[PDB]
Structure formats: structure tokens, C-alpha cells
Scaffold this active site. Structure first.
Site, PDB file in Angstrom:
ATOM      1  CG  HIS A   1     -35.995  -9.511 -69.892  1.00  0.00           C
ATOM      2  ND1 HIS A   1     -35.146 -10.270 -69.117  1.00  0.00           N
ATOM      3  CD2 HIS A   1     -37.215  -9.604 -69.314  1.00  0.00           C
ATOM      4  CE1 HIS A   1     -35.821 -10.798 -68.113  1.00  0.00           C
ATOM      5  NE2 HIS A   1     -37.080 -10.410 -68.209  1.00  0.00           N
TER       6      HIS A   1
ATOM      7  CB  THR B   1     -36.518 -33.096 -64.443  1.00  0.00           C
ATOM      8  OG1 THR B   1     -36.447 -34.356 -63.768  1.00  0.00           O
ATOM      9  CG2 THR B   1     -37.824 -33.030 -65.207  1.00  0.00           C
TER      10      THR B   1
ATOM     11  CE  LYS C   1     -33.719  -7.184 -59.882  1.00  0.00           C
ATOM     12  NZ  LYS C   1     -34.422  -8.440 -60.282  1.00  0.00           N
TER      13      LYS C   1
ATOM     14  CG  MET D   1     -46.524  -1.689 -68.015  1.00  0.00           C
ATOM     15  SD  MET D   1     -45.019  -2.637 -67.706  1.00  0.00           S
ATOM     16  CE  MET D   1     -45.228  -3.970 -68.875  1.00  0.00           C
TER      17      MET D   1
ATOM     18  CG  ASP E   1     -33.864 -30.940 -61.460  1.00  0.00           C
ATOM     19  OD1 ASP E   1     -34.679 -31.188 -62.372  1.00  0.00           O
ATOM     20  OD2 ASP E   1     -33.812 -31.582 -60.391  1.00  0.00           O
TER      21      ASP E   1
ATOM     22  N   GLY F   1     -43.737  -3.073 -62.535  1.00  0.00           N
ATOM     23  CA  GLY F   1     -43.639  -4.502 -62.769  1.00  0.00           C
ATOM     24  C   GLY F   1     -42.861  -5.025 -61.576  1.00  0.00           C
TER      25      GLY F   1
END
Ligand SMILES: Nc1ncnc2c1ncn2[C@@H]1O[C@H](CSCC[C@H](N)C(=O)O)[C@@H](O)[C@H]1O
Ligand SMILES: Nc1ncnc2c1ncn2[C@@H]1O[C@H](CSCC[C@H](N)C(=O)O)[C@@H](O)[C@H]1O
Ligand SMILES: COc1ccc(-c2coc3cc(O)cc(O)c3c2=O)cc1
Ligand SMILES: COc1ccc(-c2coc3cc(O)cc(O)c3c2=O)cc1
Ligand SMILES: [K+]
Ligand SMILES: [K+]
Ligand SMILES: [K+]
Ligand SMILES: [K+]
Ligand SMILES: [K+]
Ligand SMILES: [K+]
Ligand SMILES: [K+]
Ligand SMILES: [K+]
Ligand SMILES: [K+]
Ligand SMILES: [K+]
Ligand SMILES: [K+]
Ligand SMILES: [K+]
Ligand SMILES: [K+]
Lengths: 353, 352
Positions: free
Chosen positions: B257, B122, B253, B240, B120, B196
Site C-alpha cells: 500500500h 494534537t 503485510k 525486496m 489525541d 518487509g
């Protein structure tokens, strides 16, 4: 997709992602230039450690790892060489220049940083978001469609860009000069040459300085060579290449034919052939432009040439593959041709009448 | 800086490729907006250029432009060019490839929405100001160039909702496919906790692929506050870092990170006790990117290193195998196994 192995599907997904995010390759390059990293390393006189690099740049602590990741990607793409003593954990990595980044050291004769910044100008580069609207318009260039003006007008209302544009022209001038040095076999036996569509004579001068015994006529439209003064072996002549071309042992067409359709190139080539076959003489025509050949070039080379054919098409230009060139030559009445390297993207073609 | 001419010219070619790389992205976007993949798919066979521009109703003066774009896309792997029947007579035809089959809208695995969202105008132009961004403490790339984080941007510009949601919808299909290729991983598990787990999308996919499994979607209290699950799916709010519900396996999952090594160690320890209580010995499952220049194909490493940069623009931190291994060691686990997941993410089984 259809009843393919997931692995095959996922490999395709990765390929898709690489192309989807390919613009980051460009933006990261632009970032390295805007940050002046190549010059910083050059000033350092040796590979620079990440810590010393971010210190000179004064990178906020929460962005040091981001810089590292950017440098890592640029290094992977050939822009820097990561120097690090393996088996010494506590020791940080260092960044050295590669030939590619040496070409980004501002202030040097061949510096391509200007060309990069021009190409990646936000206004110009974003125009490519509208390739669809552009292909549905007759005759109009991508910029005419997206910006409502041509690059010439854009240049006039954008001093920043104009400054870069001119630096880019100077650097490219040095690149052609470098290229001309290995063409002695092509020029060394000529007594005279005419640079058709020679512009301000920048190329003619390079030729004359490189081959001191050769006389050169810079030939272009009257208004282009209007008040230019020729000197020692270099002169200017105004005219129309479609009507007549000055006589000489050889004719040079550099970055000229890619701006015309096949029909016009043939006409141009005929006039040039005429120019080198008069007075009972039999010279040759030299064409310096891109030659696409997926059968002869390395895959990576063909890729950039194909990319370039797309980009130039956006300004109504056209790059040709060897077969296409051959067609033109035959139609123009030439007997044979030979292709030699000029630069990494352009080749030199000798056409014999 | 005394280099050989050939070295200089090769370097110039390399530079042009990178400075014009955005065109790779833009031409891909173009093919999708033109619905070329769908046109070829419907045709049922390779389509000739003449037939293609005819259907597209391309102005005669732009036919060759379309030809050059298709030629470039074909080179990059999106189409296969098929030659004519006669010699000397050029008409090529275009066939799809696995990459473009993924661009055929209407199909289950279509990723076109992902491309449209990422590309996109923007959103994508934020990358023009990487410099300004690296000089800002903590701010994401979007916060710096759009004025706000992506979540706020979407709230303020609802039009982008259908674009973002559809992109996420295409990604989940990739996840669903991947999950069905991971039998050996979920084999023998009776219960699993998705730490999570967000809204439960992943848990739903898990339960559907393995009706035999029971899954607990675990996340912050306010995240699952008003969520309802299926007969094998339930929600639990918590932290957690404090405590993770017990189960045969824990799933993480796209979670680790976004945390520093120190915090990951904390999470991994909490997940360890989660699968080693009541005399039982389970395993922890991590689904995230695993960078490895030594084992991955050149092109794969290429995109992972690129994504490593793009993810950092949103404050994400991708890790190479060596880094993952060190976190698992310091966390108290004894061994791990990495398996193929999706194109960019891997599935790591960690054993306490
Ligand atoms: N009929 C004509 N006769 C001579 N030159 C012409 C022409 N029509 C266009 N040109 C010239 O075409 C040139 C294209 S730019 C050519 C590039 C140039 N030889 C270089 O080395 O950079 C311009 O200088 C333009 O004025
Ligand atoms: N202390 C904590 N305990 C549980 N979940 C947490 C947490 N801190 C952050 N999170 C959760 O971290 C998640 C990161 S994104 C989760 C993504 C999800 N697993 C997927 O595959 O799409 C968010 O849902 C967030 O609410
Ligand atoms: C025919 O010679 C030419 C004429 C124009 C170009 C050209 C093509 O794409 C561009 C894209 C950009 O984003 C910015 C640019 O500045 C250019 C160009 O200048 C390339 C070769
Ligand atoms: C791993 O999770 C993530 C986190 C962030 C992204 C992401 C990265 O770059 C982008 C660039 C754009 O122009 C538009 C986008 O919309 C995104 C993303 O959404 C992709 C996956
Ligand atoms: K297959
Ligand atoms: K160096
Ligand atoms: K410069
Ligand atoms: K349109
Ligand atoms: K233009
Ligand atoms: K005239
Ligand atoms: K050219
Ligand atoms: K050819
Ligand atoms: K862009
Ligand atoms: K964000
Ligand atoms: K806004
Ligand atoms: K990740
Ligand atoms: K690695």
C-alpha cells in the site's frame, strides 16, 4: 468479545473505526468548502473531470490522487455524483453536484457552507475533546468550560467567525421562508398571530410576506425590540412571556422552548394558552422545534436528531421526543396536539387548548 | 437548481450529520475516558442511569447530558438500552455490545488505546488543515501541520510513546486473533518469508500460532541489524526489489500500500521467483485492504473509503480488488483468492 465468532469481533472493530474516524467526515466536508469545489463545479456548468478540476485548483502532481480519494469519499457520502463512462478505461471520471453540494454553492440564498464553517471552527469544535471535564461541572456550558467564555463573547473577539455567523443566519432565514410556504393550512385561516420570543422580527416578516392578510406581533424582551419599527401588519411589543403574552388567534414559539427546562416550558405554554383563549375565543399555540421519535422517523433521521440533542445540551438546551412534548402539553392544560413537518430537522406542532 | 422542498430538507439533514460527525468521535472518546465500558462490565449486568451517574458521581445538572450522550452512543451501536420494569416510569439501563466490549480496558482485545491515540487532540486536529496539505508536494498531513513526520514527532514528544506503543499493542492483538482464524492459509507450509517484516512482530505471531512453521523476517539491513529471533525465526537484511529469499510462501503485510503500481509490480515479480525456484510452486500472501463496493457491506465500504483517505494522509495508497487483480496479472501470477482477515484488512493468496 467473550466467545464470539472472530467475524463478529471484526465487524465490531470496523464499526469502532468508523466512529473513531468520524471526524474525517467533517474535515473532508470542510475541505471541499475551503477548496470552493462546489462553486467551481457550478461555474463549470456541467460535471467536471478530475483533470480539469485539479488544473483549476492547481493541485501539485503528488497530491492529485489524494484529491481523488477525498472526492471519492465525499461522493460516497452523498456530496458529489461521480459520472464515468464504464467500459472506457482511458477515460477519466467527472464530478457533478448533488442536492447536498448545491446547498454549498456560496452566493446562493440557502447556502449552508457558512453554518458548516462556523460549526467546524477549530477553536469551537476542539472543545468537544473535553466532554469529560464538562460533565463534571455544574451548570457550565461546554464552551464556558473549555474557552472560559460564552459564544457571545467568542463572536465579539472573532470577526472571521462573526462574518460566517451572520451569513449563516441569513441562509437559515431563507430556509425558514421556504418552510413557511407549505404551512398555509396552518396559517391561512388566522387573522392575527404573536411570535413569542420573536427576536428582531425576521420570522414575523417571513410570516407576513407569506400570509399578507395576517397581522403579526413580534413579542420579545424590551431591549431586544428596543428601537425596532413595525410596518403594515407587523408590530413590535416588549414584555416578559412568563408574565403575560399579547392576545391573538395564535401564538408562535419557534426555537424557544428548547432553551428551557420542563418547568419553565409549562409556564410559558400556560401563558400562551391564556393569550389565545381570552375574550371567549379559542385559538391555538404553534411550536416549531425538533420532535424526536425513534418509532416514526427513519433511522438516519433519528440519528441526526439524537446527535443534535447532544450538541445542544452543550449549550444547556434540550430537544424533546414526542412523549416529552405530550407531557408538557397535558401539564399546561391543553386538550390535544398535531405534529406536521417544517424542515428536515424541525417540525411544526399545533397545540389546542 | 430547482429542487423540491423535501429534497432540500433531506439534504440539509445529510449536511448536519456530516458537519457534526466529529461528535460521533468525541462522544466515543468521552465514554472511554469515563471508563463507562468498564463500569458496566464490572456491574455484571445492565446498569441503570441512576446507578451509572451515581458511580460516576455526575453533578445533578449534567445527569441528563450524560443520558443524551449514552442515548446517542447506544444508537450508534455502543450500548443497548434496556427498559424499566414498570410502565410510565422511566429509568433505562445500559448493556454493552460487541463494539463496547472492545472498549473494556484490561481485556485482551481492548482497542481503547487505539481510540485514545487516534483521537489525541494534537494528532487529530491536523485534519483541520487538509487544504494546506493538498497544496504541498509530497509532504504527509502530519509533516505539514505538526512540522514533522509522526516518527520525528514521537521522538520529540516522548509522552506520546506510551500512547502510540499501546495503540500498536492493541492492533497486534487484532492481528493475533486474525492469524488464528487463518489455518487453511498456513496449512502445508514449512517455511515462510515475511517481506518487509519489520521488527518481527508478525513473524513471532506466525511462529507461535504455527510452531510447525519456520519464518524468515526479511527487511532492510539497518532494520533487522540488531534483532534476534526464536528457534523457528531468523532475520535477513536485503532489498525486496533486488532479491527475496526462497520459501514455500512470501508474506507482504501492509507493504504494497505504500508503493506505486509500478513498484508493486517489481516487488511482486521478485516475490514470484522467490516461491517458484527449485522446481517448487508456492504462493504469495498479501495482507492489506481490499476495497470492493460491489461485494462489501455498505458500512464496510464506508469505513474502507474513509481509511482510504486517512491512509493517503501518510502517503499510503489503498486499492480496490480490480486494481489488485491488474497488478497480479501484470506481475505474472495466474490466479488469486481473497479471504477475511480483520475488520478492514483482507488476506490475499496469489498463485504463480
Ligand atoms: N421572558 C421572555 N419573554 C420574551 N422573550 C424572551 C424571554 N426570555 C427570553 N426570550 C427570548 O427568547 C428568544 C430565544 S431565540 C428564539 C428564536 C427565534 N424565535 C427564532 O426564530 O430564531 C430570544 O429572542 C430571547 O430574547
Ligand atoms: N526494499 C525493501 N526491502 C525490504 N523491506 C523494505 C524495503 N523498503 C521498505 N521496506 C520495509 O517496508 C516496511 C513497511 S511497514 C512493514 C510492516 C509490517 N509488514 C507489518 O505488518 O507491520 C518497513 O519495515 C520497511 O523497512
Ligand atoms: C439553542 O440554539 C443553539 C445554540 C448553540 C448551538 C451550537 C452547538 O454546538 C456547536 C459546536 C461547534 O463546534 C460550533 C458551534 O458554533 C456550535 C453551536 O452554535 C446549537 C443550537
Ligand atoms: C496502515 O497503516 C496506518 C498508517 C497511518 C494510520 C493513521 C491514520 O490517521 C491517524 C490520525 C490521527 O489523528 C492519529 C494517528 O495516530 C493516525 C494514524 O496512525 C493508521 C494506519
Ligand atoms: K457471536
Ligand atoms: K453538475
Ligand atoms: K454564503
Ligand atoms: K475531569
Ligand atoms: K455558551
Ligand atoms: K414586564
Ligand atoms: K430545538
Ligand atoms: K417518543
Ligand atoms: K478533531
Ligand atoms: K507520517
Ligand atoms: K513538536
Ligand atoms: K493498506
Ligand atoms: K470498487
Amino acid at each position: 468479545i467473550n466467545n464470539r465468532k472472530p467475524s463478529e469481533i471484526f465487524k465490531a472493530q470496523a464499526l469502532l473505526y468508523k466512529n473513531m474516524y468520524a471526524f474525517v467526515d467533517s474535515m473532508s466536508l470542510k475541505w471541499s468548502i475551503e477548496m470552493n469545489i462546489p462553486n467551481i463545479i457550478h461555474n463549470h456548468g456541467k460535471p467536471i473531470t478530475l483533470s480539469n478540476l485539479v488544473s483549476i485548483l492547481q493541485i501539485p502532481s503528488t497530491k492529485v490522487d489524494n484529491v481523488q480519494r477525498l472526492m471519492r469519499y465525499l461522493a460516497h457520502n452523498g456530496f458529489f455524483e461521480i459520472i464515468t463512462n464504464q467500459e472506457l478505461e482511458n477515460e477519466e471520471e467527472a464530478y457533478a453536484l448533488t442536492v447536498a453540494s448545491e446547498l454549498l454553492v456560496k452566493g446562493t440564498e440557502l447556502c449552508l457552507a457558512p453554518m458548516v464553517e462556523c460549526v467546524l471552527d477549530p477553536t469551537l469544535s476542539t472543545s468537544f475533546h473535553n466532554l469529560k471535564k464538562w460533565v463534571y461541572e455544574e451548570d457550565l456550558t461546554l464552551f464556558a468550560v473549555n474557552l472560559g467564555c460564552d459564544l457571545w463573547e467568542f463572536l465579539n473577539k472573532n470577526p472571521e467567525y462573526n462574518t460566517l455567523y451572520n451569513d449563516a443566519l441569513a441562509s437559515d432565514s431563507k430556509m425558514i421562508n421556504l418552510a413557511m410556504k407549505d404551512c398555509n393550512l396552518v396559517f391561512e385561516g388566522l387573522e392575527s398571530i404573536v411570535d413569542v420570543g420573536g427576536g428582531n422580527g425576521t420570522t414575523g416578516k417571513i410570516i407576513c410576506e407569506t400570509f399578507p392578510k395576517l397581522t403579526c406581533v413580534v413579542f420579545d424582551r424590551p431591549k431586544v425590540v428596543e428601537n425596532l419599527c413595525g410596518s403594515n401588519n407587523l408590530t413590535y411589543v416588549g414584555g416578559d412571556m412568563f408574565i403575560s403574552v399579547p392576545k391573538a388567534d395564535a401564538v408562535l414559539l419557534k426555537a424557544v422552548l428548547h432553551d428551557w427546562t420542563d418547568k419553565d416550558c409549562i409556564k410559558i405554554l400556560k401563558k400562551c394558552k391564556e393569550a389565545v383563549t381570552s375574550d371567549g375565543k379559542r385559538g391555538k399555540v404553534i411550536v416549531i422545534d425538533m420532535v424526536i421519535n425513534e418509532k416514526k422517523d427513519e433511522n438516519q433521521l433519528t440519528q441526526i436528531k439524537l446527535l443534535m440533542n447532544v450538541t445542544i445540551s452543550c449549550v444547556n438546551g434540550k430537544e424533546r421526543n414526542e412523549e416529552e412534548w405530550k407531557k408538557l402539553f397535558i401539564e399546561a392544560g391543553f386538550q390535544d396536539y398535531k405534529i406536521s413537518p417544517f424542515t428536515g430537522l424541525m417540525s411544526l406542532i399545533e397545540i389546542y387548548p
